[PDB]
Design a protein around this ligand. Structure first.
Ligand SMILES: *CCC(=O)Nc1cccc(C)c1Nc1ncc(OCc2c(Cl)c(OC)cc(OC)c2Cl)cn1
Length: 280
């Protein structure tokens, strides 16, 4: 196979120093690495980056999957609250797609690790605000995520929330059961919209305020379907205000057209971040 070069995105292969693999626990073959001179002005600067590449046993679908993902990230463009495309190696060897490094891992591990054996209320609302700003931006570029959860948000060395894997039965993965994040129309009718991501955002808010708890406590997966059809929703977590719980319930409206938009959620969360104190 032969790829076209975009000199804007192309990094010479000897500027990339590959490091430790991540393996199962991230989608596809991902390698931590160091890119040398990623800004032309600062060619002696080294930047930490993540690299996606193909396995040894990769099919023709796998190659095209990695090319479509890379191209979709160009279409979408840059936001501080998404994992940004930084560059690619397309020419004198296999396909590398190079993205931003998030030193503190996924949001679920970050929240779990900072449980009392720490985060203020403002940190947690500021986290939800940043995840909302990322999703508002992705929505504006017509990008439906289809698997929004804390595990698919990453955290940088400066505690910036970056949405991950946006350019892509009830059995476990990591050990996660995705169905718990799916809107009813997605679960029952295989329908995915921007409104289905707002449902999943509701479950992500619940994740943030329980410091990375399992959604629907004490509910077996077998009887979760019946409970949703009955109109059951998760109850309010204790580290959470009535305003923020009213926001969750609004995200979990049974009719997708009656849920708030990410634009609407960013406006409300902008206000709540200012009203929330750094001692509360
Ligand atoms: C899998 C999530 C996680 O916990 N990652 C992790 C684990 C231990 C240490 C570190 C530093 C990280 N951070 C990290 N993992 C992956 C990553 O980028 C993955 C990626 C890629 Cl390669 C991609 O290429 C097309 C597109 C993405 O989303 C748009 C993502 Cl998230 C960055 N940092």
């Amino acid at each position: 196979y032969e790829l076209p070069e975009d000199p804007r995105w192309e990094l010479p292969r000897d500027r990339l120093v590959l490091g430790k693999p991540l393996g199962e626990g991230c989608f596809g073959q991902v390698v931590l690495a160091e890119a040398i001179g990623l800004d032309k002005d600062k060619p002696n600067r080294v930047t930490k980056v993540a690299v996606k590449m193909l396995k040894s046993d990769a099919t023709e679908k796998d190659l095209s999957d990695l090319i479509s993902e890379m191209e979709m990230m160009k279409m979408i463009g840059k936001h501080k609250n998404i994992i940004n495309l930084l560059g690619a190696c397309t020419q004198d060897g296999p396909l590398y797609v190079i993205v931003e490094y998030a030193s503190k891992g996924n949001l679920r591990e970050y929240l779990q690790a900072r449980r009392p054996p720490q985060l203020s209320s403002k940190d947690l609302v500021s986290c939800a605000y940043q995840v909302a700003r990322g999703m508002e931006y992705l929505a504006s570029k017509k990008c439906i995520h289809r698997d929004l959860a804390a595990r698919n948000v990453l955290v940088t060395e400066d505690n910036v929330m970056k949405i991950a894997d946006f350019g892509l039965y009830y059995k476990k993965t990591n050990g996660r059961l995705p169905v718990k994040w799916m809107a009813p129309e997605a679960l029952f009718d295989r329908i995915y919209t921007h409104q289905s991501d707002v449902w999943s955002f509701g479950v992500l808010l619940w994740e943030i305020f329980t410091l990375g708890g399992s959604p629907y406590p004490g509910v077996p997966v077998e009887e979760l379907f019946k409970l949703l059809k009955e109109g059951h929703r998760m109850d309010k977590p204790s580290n959470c205000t009535n305003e923020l719980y009213m926001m969750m319930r609004d995200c979990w409206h049974a009719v997708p057209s009656q849920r708030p938009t990410f634009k609407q959620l960013v406006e409300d969360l902008d206000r709540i971040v200012a009203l929330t104190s750094n001692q509360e």
